[PDB]
Design an enzyme around this catalytic site. Structure first.
Site, mmCIF file in Angstrom:
data_model
loop_
_atom_site.group_PDB
_atom_site.id
_atom_site.type_symbol
_atom_site.label_atom_id
_atom_site.label_comp_id
_atom_site.label_asym_id
_atom_site.label_seq_id
_atom_site.Cartn_x
_atom_site.Cartn_y
_atom_site.Cartn_z
ATOM 1 N N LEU A 42 0.801 -1.218 0.000
ATOM 2 C CA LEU A 42 0.000 0.000 0.000
ATOM 3 C C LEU A 42 0.835 1.271 0.000
ATOM 4 C CD1 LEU A 42 -2.777 -0.936 2.609
ATOM 5 C CD2 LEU A 42 -2.934 -1.037 0.113
ATOM 6 N N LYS B 126 2.062 -2.652 8.995
ATOM 7 C CA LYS B 126 3.274 -1.855 8.863
ATOM 8 C C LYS B 126 4.464 -2.654 9.376
ATOM 9 C CE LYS B 126 5.292 2.671 9.815
ATOM 10 N NZ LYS B 126 4.990 4.066 10.224
ATOM 11 N N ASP C 199 5.299 15.282 11.075
ATOM 12 C CA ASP C 199 5.288 14.773 9.705
ATOM 13 C C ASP C 199 3.921 14.973 9.056
ATOM 14 O OD1 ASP C 199 6.503 13.733 7.471
ATOM 15 O OD2 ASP C 199 6.245 11.633 8.059
HETATM 16 C C1 LIG Z 1 -0.003 7.359 5.782
HETATM 17 C C2 LIG Z 1 1.045 7.033 5.053
HETATM 18 C C3 LIG Z 1 2.144 6.159 5.661
HETATM 19 C C4 LIG Z 1 2.379 4.888 4.850
HETATM 20 N N1 LIG Z 1 1.108 4.408 4.336
HETATM 21 C C5 LIG Z 1 0.146 3.880 5.058
HETATM 22 C C6 LIG Z 1 -0.877 3.560 4.197
HETATM 23 C C7 LIG Z 1 -2.230 2.926 4.535
HETATM 24 N N2 LIG Z 1 -3.074 2.675 3.544
HETATM 25 C C8 LIG Z 1 -4.269 2.134 3.758
HETATM 26 N N3 LIG Z 1 -5.182 1.859 2.653
HETATM 27 C C9 LIG Z 1 -4.921 2.026 1.220
HETATM 28 C C10 LIG Z 1 -3.745 2.570 0.708
HETATM 29 C C11 LIG Z 1 -3.566 2.708 -0.661
HETATM 30 C C12 LIG Z 1 -4.570 2.305 -1.530
HETATM 31 C C13 LIG Z 1 -4.404 2.447 -3.046
HETATM 32 C C14 LIG Z 1 -5.558 2.829 -3.899
HETATM 33 C C15 LIG Z 1 -5.307 2.539 -5.377
HETATM 34 N N4 LIG Z 1 -4.877 1.138 -5.596
HETATM 35 C C16 LIG Z 1 -3.714 0.770 -4.750
HETATM 36 C C17 LIG Z 1 -3.984 1.043 -3.272
HETATM 37 C C18 LIG Z 1 -5.745 1.767 -1.029
HETATM 38 C C19 LIG Z 1 -5.918 1.632 0.340
HETATM 39 N N5 LIG Z 1 -4.672 1.831 4.976
HETATM 40 C C20 LIG Z 1 -3.869 2.063 6.050
HETATM 41 N N6 LIG Z 1 -4.042 1.847 7.395
HETATM 42 C C21 LIG Z 1 -2.962 2.241 8.067
HETATM 43 C C22 LIG Z 1 -2.050 2.733 7.147
HETATM 44 C C23 LIG Z 1 -2.625 2.619 5.862
HETATM 45 C C24 LIG Z 1 -0.471 3.918 2.918
HETATM 46 N N7 LIG Z 1 0.755 4.440 3.014
#
Ligand SMILES: C=CCCn1cc(-c2nc(Nc3ccc(C4CCNCC4)cc3)nc3[nH]ccc23)cn1
Length: 289
Positions: free
Chosen positions: A13, A40, A134
């Site tokens: 993700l 994570k 951040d």
């Molecule tokens: C905050 C930034 C620090 C690092 N980080 C954390 C996350 C994150 N992402 C998600 N959901 C999610 C993320 C991307 C997509 C895309 C959509 C389009 N197609 C591919 C996937 C879809 C759902 N849930 C989470 N829970 C806790 C963290 C977290 C992402 N980056």
């Protein structure tokens, strides 16, 4: 509480500071009925990154707010190796990518709704004397179209009980285009420096994450794209000290831009509180409706 053998990898993700986040299904019954979770992990488990990761886990576990990503548990292997943080999966991803994709159907009233929710979540952090350090739209997650959550706390520090600032300099690359001046010069981080960063988040939202309008792109053009390496932060410090600021985004009202400029005060003590930010944003939002 989560056993590693029942975590089934699905896709990556995101990748942030010293690690990554994966989409997984926790299926302990092995019948494809378990929920999808976010996991994570550290990309390399140094004992300095490990204890920082353990402190991040304790910080998130102690946060219960509608606009903070929900902690679910932990998971480790061989004794206590390969520590993993289990969080709720938010289906729309980061606010930065979400806003860029749906920019044509997200109006200003919707932006202020996101703005107000971020402020209430940041105020909740202040009551625990947490400094996020951040704040950026890439670190905000979208649960649904009407709710966002602060979604990462890898750099969050606890204030000393006797001071109102925390001094720290991380070895590596820092998000210097979101940093308050006193954070660039003295490495001081406080609630007021989070308020500076929040102003950059407000700027991000009203640019709709457009290509040439990102804070790095706007700052590097103001100081000239000629600047190299460490002369970037030196020229950024000088630019901010002379009241060089990010421009008003296209279509952004004056009252919204003035909130940003008030957040971007060189005088640390003159920056508004998060409660006052939520008040002005909410009253503007009510005037539009
Ligand atoms: C905050 C930034 C620090 C690092 N980080 C954390 C996350 C994150 N992402 C998600 N959901 C999610 C993320 C991307 C997509 C895309 C959509 C389009 N197609 C591919 C996937 C879809 C759902 N849930 C989470 N829970 C806790 C963290 C977290 C992402 N980056």
């Amino acid at each position: 509480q989560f056993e590693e053998r029942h975590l089934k990898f699905l896709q990556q993700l995101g990748k942030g500071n010293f690690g990554s986040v994966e989409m997984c299904r926790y299926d302990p019954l092995q019948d494809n009925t378990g929920e999808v979770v976010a996991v994570k992990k550290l990309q390399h488990s140094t004992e300095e990154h490990l204890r920082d990761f353990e402190r991040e886990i304790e910080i998130l576990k102690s946060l219960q707010h509608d606009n903070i990503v929900k902690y679910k548990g932990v998971c480790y292997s061989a004794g206590r190796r390969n520590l993993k943080l289990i969080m709720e999966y938010l289906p729309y991803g980061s606010l930065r990518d979400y806003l860029q994709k749906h920019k044509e159907r997200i109006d200003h009233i919707k932006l202020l709704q996101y703005t107000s929710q971020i402020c209430k979540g940041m105020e909740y952090l202040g009551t625990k004397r947490y400094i996020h350090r951040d704040l950026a739209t890439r670190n905000i997650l979208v649960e649904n179209e009407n709710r966002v959550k602060i979604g990462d706390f890898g750099l969050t520090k606890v204030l000393p009980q006797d001071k109102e600032y925390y001094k720290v300099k991380e070895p590596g690359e820092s998000p210097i285009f979101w940093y308050a001046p006193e954070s660039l010069t003295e490495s001081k981080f406080s609630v007021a420096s989070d308020v500076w960063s929040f102003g950059v988040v407000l700027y991000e939202l009203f640019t709709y994450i457009e290509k040439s309008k990102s804070p790095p792109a706007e700052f590097m053009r103001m100081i000239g794209n000629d600047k190299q390496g460490q002369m970037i932060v030196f020229h950024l410090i000088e630019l901010l000290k002379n009241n060089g600021r990010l421009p008003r985004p296209d279509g952004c009202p004056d009252e919204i831009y003035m909130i940003m400029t008030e957040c971007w005060n060189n005088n640390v003590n003159q920056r508004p509180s998060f409660r006052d930010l939520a008040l002005r944003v909410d009253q503007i939002r009510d005037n539009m409706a």
